[PDB]
Amino acid sequence: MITKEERAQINADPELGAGNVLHRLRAYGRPTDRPVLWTDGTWRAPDGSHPEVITLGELYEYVETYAGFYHGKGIRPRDVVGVLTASSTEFAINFMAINSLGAIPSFANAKLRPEIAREYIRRQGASGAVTDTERHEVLAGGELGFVVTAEDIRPEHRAQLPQGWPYRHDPTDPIIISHSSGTTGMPKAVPHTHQTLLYAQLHRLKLSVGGSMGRLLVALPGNHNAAMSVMMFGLLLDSPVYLQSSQRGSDVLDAIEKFKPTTVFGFSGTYGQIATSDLSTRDMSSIEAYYNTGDAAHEAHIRVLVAQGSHEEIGPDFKPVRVPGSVFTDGLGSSETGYSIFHNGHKPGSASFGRCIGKPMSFAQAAVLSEDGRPLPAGEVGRLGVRSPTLTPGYWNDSLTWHKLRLGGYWLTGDLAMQDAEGNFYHLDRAPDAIRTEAGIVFSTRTEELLLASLPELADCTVTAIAEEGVRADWDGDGVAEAYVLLQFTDGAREPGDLTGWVNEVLAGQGFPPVTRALRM
Amino acid sequence: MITKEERAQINADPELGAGNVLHRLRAYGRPTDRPVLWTDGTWRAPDGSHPEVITLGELYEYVETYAGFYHGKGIRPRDVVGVLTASSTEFAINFMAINSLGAIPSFANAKLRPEIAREYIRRQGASGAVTDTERHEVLAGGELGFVVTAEDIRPEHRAQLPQGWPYRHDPTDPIIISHSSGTTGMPKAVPHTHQTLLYAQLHRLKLSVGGSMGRLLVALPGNHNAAMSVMMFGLLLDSPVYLQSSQRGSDVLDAIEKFKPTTVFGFSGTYGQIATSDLSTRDMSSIEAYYNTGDAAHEAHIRVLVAQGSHEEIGPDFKPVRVPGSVFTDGLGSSETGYSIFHNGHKPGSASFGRCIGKPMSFAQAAVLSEDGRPLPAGEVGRLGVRSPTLTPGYWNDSLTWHKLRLGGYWLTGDLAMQDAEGNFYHLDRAPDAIRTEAGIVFSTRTEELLLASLPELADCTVTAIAEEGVRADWDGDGVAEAYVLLQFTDGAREPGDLTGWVNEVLAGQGFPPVTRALRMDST
Amino acid sequence: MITKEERAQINADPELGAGNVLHRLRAYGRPTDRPVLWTDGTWRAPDGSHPEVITLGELYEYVETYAGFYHGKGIRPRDVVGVLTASSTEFAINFMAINSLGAIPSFANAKLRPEIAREYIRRQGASGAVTDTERHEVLAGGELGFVVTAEDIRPEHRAQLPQGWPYRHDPTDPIIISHSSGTTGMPKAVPHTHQTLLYAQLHRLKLSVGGSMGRLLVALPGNHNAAMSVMMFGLLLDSPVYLQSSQRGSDVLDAIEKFKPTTVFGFSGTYGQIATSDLSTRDMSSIEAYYNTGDAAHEAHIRVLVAQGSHEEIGPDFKPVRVPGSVFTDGLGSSETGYSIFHNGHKPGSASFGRCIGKPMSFAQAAVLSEDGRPLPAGEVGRLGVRSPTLTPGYWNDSLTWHKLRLGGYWLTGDLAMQDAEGNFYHLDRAPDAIRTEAGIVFSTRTEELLLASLPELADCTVTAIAEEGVRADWDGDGVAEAYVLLQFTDGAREPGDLTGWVNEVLAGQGFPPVTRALRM
Ligand SMILES: [Mg+2]
Numbered sequence A, C: 001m002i003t004k005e006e007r008a009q010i011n012a013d014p015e016l017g018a019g020n021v022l023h024r025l026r027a028y029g030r031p032t033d034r035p036v037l038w039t040d041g042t043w044r045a046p047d048g049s050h051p052e053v054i055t056l057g058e059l060y061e062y063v064e065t066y067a068g069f070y071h072g073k074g075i076r077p078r079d080v081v082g083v084l085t086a087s088s089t090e091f092a093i094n095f096m097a098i099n100s101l102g103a104i105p106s107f108a109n110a111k112l113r114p115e116i117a118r119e120y121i122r123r124q125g126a127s128g129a130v131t132d133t134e135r136h137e138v139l140a141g142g143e144l145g146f147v148v149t150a151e152d153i154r155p156e157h158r159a160q161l162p163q164g165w166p167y168r169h170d171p172t173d174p175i176i177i178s179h180s181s182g183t184t185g186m187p188k189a190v191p192h193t194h195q196t197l198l199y200a201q202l203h204r205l206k207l208s209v210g211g212s213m214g215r216l217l218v219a220l221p222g223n224h225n226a227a228m229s230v231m232m233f234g235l236l237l238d239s240p241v242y243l244q245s246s247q248r249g250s251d252v253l254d255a256i257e258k259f260k261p262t263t264v265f266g267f268s269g270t271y272g273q274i275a276t277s278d279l280s281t282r283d284m285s286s287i288e289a290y291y292n293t294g295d296a297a298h299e300a301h302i303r304v305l306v307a308q309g310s311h312e313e314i315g316p317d318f319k320p321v322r323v324p325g326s327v328f329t330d331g332l333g334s335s336e337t338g339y340s341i342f343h344n345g346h347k348p349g350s351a352s353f354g355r356c357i358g359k360p361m362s363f364a365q366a367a368v369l370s371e372d373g374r375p376l377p378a379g380e381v382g383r384l385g386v387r388s389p390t391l392t393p394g395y396w397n398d399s400l401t402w403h404k405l406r407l408g409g410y411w412l413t414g415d416l417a418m419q420d421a422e423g424n425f426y427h428l429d430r431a432p433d434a435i436r437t438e439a440g441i442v443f444s445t446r447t448e449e450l451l452l453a454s455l456p457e458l459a460d461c462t463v464t465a466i467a468e469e470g471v472r473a474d475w476d477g478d479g480v481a482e483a484y485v486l487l488q489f490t491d492g493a494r495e496p497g498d499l500t501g502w503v504n505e506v507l508a509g510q511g512f513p514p515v516t517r518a519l520r521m
Numbered sequence B: 001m002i003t004k005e006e007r008a009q010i011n012a013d014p015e016l017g018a019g020n021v022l023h024r025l026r027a028y029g030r031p032t033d034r035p036v037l038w039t040d041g042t043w044r045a046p047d048g049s050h051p052e053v054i055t056l057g058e059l060y061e062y063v064e065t066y067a068g069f070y071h072g073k074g075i076r077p078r079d080v081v082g083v084l085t086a087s088s089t090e091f092a093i094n095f096m097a098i099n100s101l102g103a104i105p106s107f108a109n110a111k112l113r114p115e116i117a118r119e120y121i122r123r124q125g126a127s128g129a130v131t132d133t134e135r136h137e138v139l140a141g142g143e144l145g146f147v148v149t150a151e152d153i154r155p156e157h158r159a160q161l162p163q164g165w166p167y168r169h170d171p172t173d174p175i176i177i178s179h180s181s182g183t184t185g186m187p188k189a190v191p192h193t194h195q196t197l198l199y200a201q202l203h204r205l206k207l208s209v210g211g212s213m214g215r216l217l218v219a220l221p222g223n224h225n226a227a228m229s230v231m232m233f234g235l236l237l238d239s240p241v242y243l244q245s246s247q248r249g250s251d252v253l254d255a256i257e258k259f260k261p262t263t264v265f266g267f268s269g270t271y272g273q274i275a276t277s278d279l280s281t282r283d284m285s286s287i288e289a290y291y292n293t294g295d296a297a298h299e300a301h302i303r304v305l306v307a308q309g310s311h312e313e314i315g316p317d318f319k320p321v322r323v324p325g326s327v328f329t330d331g332l333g334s335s336e337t338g339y340s341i342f343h344n345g346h347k348p349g350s351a352s353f354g355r356c357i358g359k360p361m362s363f364a365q366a367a368v369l370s371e372d373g374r375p376l377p378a379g380e381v382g383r384l385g386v387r388s389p390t391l392t393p394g395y396w397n398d399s400l401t402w403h404k405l406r407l408g409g410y411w412l413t414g415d416l417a418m419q420d421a422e423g424n425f426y427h428l429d430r431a432p433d434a435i436r437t438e439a440g441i442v443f444s445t446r447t448e449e450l451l452l453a454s455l456p457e458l459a460d461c462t463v464t465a466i467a468e469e470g471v472r473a474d475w476d477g478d479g480v481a482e483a484y485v486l487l488q489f490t491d492g493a494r495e496p497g498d499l500t501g502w503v504n505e506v507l508a509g510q511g512f513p514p515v516t517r518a519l520r521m522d523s524t
C-alpha cells in the first residue's frame, strides 16, 4: 500500500509521466524484491523462462535488456517500433523499454487482417517491429528494417544500454501509438504523450482515489493504451497488477480465482461472458469493483456482477463499513482520450441510468455541438465533442482526418447526444448507426436493444438500413432510407402477428420511430 | 426566449461583465419599451413616484440620473459608496449607477445593529453613503462625506452625467462589496470584480446550460451579491425579473401569485416558512424550479415544495415531456464564492439525502483538507476548502483575516466534510460546532439532528461547548470539551424520568459518540 | 491612418484571426470604395480583367465569387485545396476564399519540379487545386478531383455563395498550408491555424505601430506564409499593400518607384540584388523601413540600403522629428514559427552585430539546448530551440518528422547557438554544417567566412568533411571527420604556396580550430 509520504512524493515529482514510471519508482528507492506484476506466462523473458510473477528488480533487469537490444538494432529517440503481439506482458515490457530510449512503441492488435497490419505500420514510417511467433510472418519479408521476436532478445544485449539512459521526456513527447479496437478499414493511429497518457491518473492521486485499488486485474486488450494506463497507475500505487491476455470470460474467471483481484478492468464482451457463466462455483469474494471501458456494458450483466464480493461504504458514524456487493463503473471514452471522460457507477441497489452518462470529469469539458459547432441548448440532438488534457495531439501521420474530426475546438467522439437542463449528457447512438427514415431518426442500437429487452422470444435482432442507389442516410448524410429489422428467435413462441406490427407496437410504446418491416431468420 | 443570434452576441462580447450589463444591453440594441424589472414599490424614483414595472429605457434614465448625481457629489473611479437600505430595488439602482462611475457600491443589511453598520462602512474608506429614510440616522453625523436618500436625487441630476460615461471596467476591477448573513460580530467585507460576479452566469451562457428561466422571482436579501448576480443574469437573458424585498413566507407567496415566476430564488428561512403554510389556497402553477443558498433547506420542507408546478424532462423517445413537480436546487457557496459551488437538485421522487452536497461545479475545485493543508483520502474528515474563478480577491481592508481563512491554496468555508470514493462531498458541520470528547469527535449539529427522526418530543434541542470559562476544545482547539443535550418539551406529556439516558440510546443506535447530561431550562 | 477606436475595436475582437480579416473589416464597417490592394497585374479577375488596384468592396466581390465557385466544386470545411501559382495576388485571393469555406488552401512554389509538386500535394490529401496557366499541366490529368485556373471562375459563380458564409473558425482550425524555400527534396508542409498565423501581428498591435508601416511593399515569395501574414496585417492597419510577385531586385525596384512604399518586405537575395544596383537612377525617397525574413542579409548590403530614405526618431518635446536614413530589420524567422522570433535592427551608423541576434520577442521562449533538452548556461554551444504561440501545430501528415524536429518541448530551428551572460543569443552555424574534428568543432560557414574576409585573393572557398564512408560527423553524428578547405583564388591572384599552413594561420589567429588540408580547383 501507498503511505502519505509516498503519495506526496508522487505529487511532488514534476518529471513523472507515461515515459518514465518505472524509472521514477527507482528514483523513489522502492524495494526491488517486491513482486510488482503478475502474468499469464505468455511472454518469454530474455533468459528463456516465462515469468509468472516479476519483481521490481527483475522489471528493471528485463527493461534494461530490451532497451539495450533496441539501441543495438539502431533505435533512436523519435523512431517508431511496431509491437504486434497477443500477450499483455509483451506489450508492457516493449512499451517501457522502447519508451526509455525515447522511441515510440506502436501497438497493433494481433488479429488485424495481415495486409491491414502490414500497411497500418508502413504508414507510420516505423523503423522495425517486434511480434509474437504467430504474427511474425505478418511483418517479416517486408520493408521493415528488422522484424524480431522475443527469442531474439537475450541477456547479453543489456550491456548495450546507451550512456545517459533512460530518456528524459518532455511532457509533450510521444510515448505510444495505439489504435481503437472494433474498427473497419484502416485503424486510425492515435499517439499519446508523456503527459497525456497518465493525466487523469495523476489527477486522482493529487486528491483521493476511489475503492483504494488493491490488487488490479487488467483484462483489457493489451493493444489498447488503457492496458498500459491502468498498469502504470497500479505500479505507482504499489498495487499488484496482473496482466491477463485472453478476454475470454472463463480465462478471466480463472484469473480472478487465482489472483483474487479487488478491482477488475475489462471490455463489455468479457463482462458478458462472465455474467452468463455459472458463477456459483467461482470464488469472486475478493472483487470490490469492476471498471469497463469502450462501449457500455449490458445492464443485466452488470446486475449479475455487482452481486459478487463486497465494497466499503461510508457508515453513519462516518467510518468505512463493508457491505455485500461490488461497484461496476462504465466509462465512456476512446483511445483518443486516454481515459474515460464520463463515469457511471452501479452498486447492487443502484437505479437504471437509462441513457444518462452524467457529467464529464472535472478536467474535461464536453458539449453537444450543432453542425456548425455551436453548443446546442438542452434537449437537442447533436455531435458529442470533448476537450481534455488527456486528449491525443492528433492521429499519427494523418493531419487531414484529425481536423475533419474536430469541430469548434472539440474533438468529435462520433456519438450523438443531448443535454438535459441540469447539464447531464445523454448518449443516443453512434452517428453512423443513426438512420434517417420518414418516421424520424431511427437510432439502430437503441432500437435493437429495446426490442431484445421487450421480446424474450428473440435471441438476436438487427436494424439495417435500405436506401435507394448510392443514397447516404446516416447522421453525416442527407438522404432517407427504410429501416428493416432482422429477427432471430429462440426455440419457438413465434408471433406471426404481423412481426412488423409486433415490433412496432414496442417501438410505439417508447415513442420510437417504427421500422418498415421485421423479418425472421 | 433568448434567440441563437442573441446568445452569440452575448458570447462575442468581450466587455460584458458585472460592471456594465445594462450598457451592453443598450449596445445590443434591445427594445427600450420592454418591461425588464418588476418591483415591490419600495423604491422612490427621482420623479417622486414608486414604479412597480420599469422598462429598459426607463432603467437607463434612472441609472443615468443616479450616476450624474453621485458624480456631482464628487465620486470618482475606485471610491466606495455605501448602500444601507431594505429595498431590493433600491440596492439595484444604486448598484448599477455607482458601478457606471467606476466606484464600488457597498451593500449593507438595513436590519444590522446601528453600531455595527456604522463601523463596517467606516473601515471601508467609503466616500459617502445612500440610505432609505429609516436607516439614515445610523450613518449620518460621522465621517462620510455625505449621507443621502432617494428624494435627494432629482431628475435635474441627470444632466450631471460625466463625459465618457459609462465606465470601461477591467476584468479585475471591483464592482461590489457585500457581507455575509451571520452576526459573527462584525461582518467581513467581501469585494467582487467585473469578472467574478458574473463568471458562473457567463460560463453557463457560453455552454447553453440552463433552461426554464423565463420569469425570475428574486426574493434573496438584496444586500447579498447573489441578488445582483441573478437580476443581471435575467436582464441578459431578457427574462422578467421581480425584486421582492421581504422574505416573509406570506409576501413571497403573494409574489408567486402576482408575478407567476418560473424560477424562484431565496434563502432557506423563506422556503422553511412557505413550505409550512396552507399551500392549498395558493396559485403556484408557474413554479418549475427553486434555488436556495445560505442555509441548507431542511429536506422535510423540500419535499412539500417539489410538489408544486411542473417541469420538462427527457421522455423515453428523447423528446421533452412535461411532468408534474418542480426542481429544488440547493447550492452551497457563500458571499465569497459569487455563485454556488456545490449543488443538489431535488425532484418529486428524491434520494439525495443526508448532507450530501454532490460535487463542485466544473469551473471550481474543492477538497477536504488536513491540518497540514493537504487533501485527505476519502473517508477522512477535514476542513472543506474551495478554489474558483468566481472567488473573491479577498476581504476588503482585512488581509489578516483573509489569509487566516485560507489553507493549501483553498479558501476555507469553515465547514467539515468528507468524501465518498466517487468524489461526492458530505457537509458534516460548521467547525465552531465541533466538540472533541474522549471516544471521538461528536458533531454538534449532527447530534442535534439525530434527535429529530428518532426522539420526536421536542421542538428544538441544542449542543453547547461549556468547558472551562473560555477554554476552547473546538476542531481548531486542542482541548476536550463536554458536549451537551439541552432540550425543549412543548405542552402535553411525553416526558420521562431519566434526564440523561433518553438521549443516549438513539445516539448509540446511529453510531454517535457520548453526550454527558441533559436538563430543562424555561424558554428564556 | 487608423484611429484609437478602430485599434481598440480590433484589440477587442475575440473572433479576429487569420481566417476572417476580410469579414471583420466589413463588421468594422470600413469604407468599401477605398483602395486597399495594389497588384502587379499578374492575376485575372473573374470578369477577365487584371486589376492593378482593388477596392475593399471589390475585394469582397472577388472572394465571394471564388467562395461560390469552390463551393459548387464540392469543397467543404477541412478540405485541402492546392494553390500552385506564381502570382502573389492570386495566392492571396484564393487563400481568403478557400478560408471562408473552412477549407484549407495549400500553397506550393510554382517552380517545384512537376514530379514533386504532384506528390507534395497528393500526400496532403487535397480535393483539388487551382494553378496559374503555366503550371496547369503539372497537376492536370492526375488523381485530383479538379484542376482549375482563374479562367474557370466567372462572376456567375458568386451566385453559388453558400448559406451561412463566411466560415466561423475556431482558433485552432487550420487556415493555410505552405512550405519553405531553399530546401532540397520533398518540402515539409507547414500548417497554420486561425490564431497562429496572425498572433505576432495582433500582439504587436497592443503597441503603437506609430506609422512606420505606412505603405507595405510585400515582395516576399507568394507561396510563403509570411506574405499572407504581412498582407493581412496591412489590411488591418488600413495601410496600402502592394503585392510584388518577382523577387528580382530590378522588378522590386520598379515596384518601389511605382508604389513608393514606406516599408519593404523581402528575402535577403532580393535585398542583395538591390543593394548592388546603380541606385542613382532610382527614387527610394519614401523608404523608412526594410524588413527581411528568414536568413539574415549580408551586412555589406544592409549598409547600402539604410542609406536610403528618412525615418522618425523621438524629439526633446516628445513629438517625432524626421532624420535621414532608414531601418533594416533582420529577423530570423521560419515557416514554422512564422513571424520573426528574433529582431536585429540596423540603422545608419549602427554597430555591426557579429554573431549576435538579440533576445526573442516577448511572446516566444528561446533556449540553447543540451542534447537531452535542457537549457544551457552562458558560454556553451547547443541547439537553438523555440516555443511560441506562433508555432505551427506540426507538419501536415508527417507526425514522424515533426517530432524528430522537437527537443525538450521546443521546436529545433536547425541552428547551433549560445547565450552571453546578459541573455542575448548568438548564431554559430547550422547543425548540419558543424564538422566534428579533433581540432574540435569547425563551423563550416564561419571558417569559410573568416578566410574569405581576411585573405582577399579568394572569390570563394569551401569547407567539406572527409571521414570513413557511413560515419556521420555533423553534430547529430557521433563520429569524426577531417576538414578540408578548397580554395578558388581570384582571376590573376598571386597564388602562394603550402596553403594548409596558410589558412591554418588566419583561422588559428582568430581562435578557429585548424583545418586538415587546403587544395584548389
Ligand atoms: Mg433516457
Ligand SMILES: [Mg+2]
Binding pocket: A433, A444, A445
Ligand atoms: Mg450497430
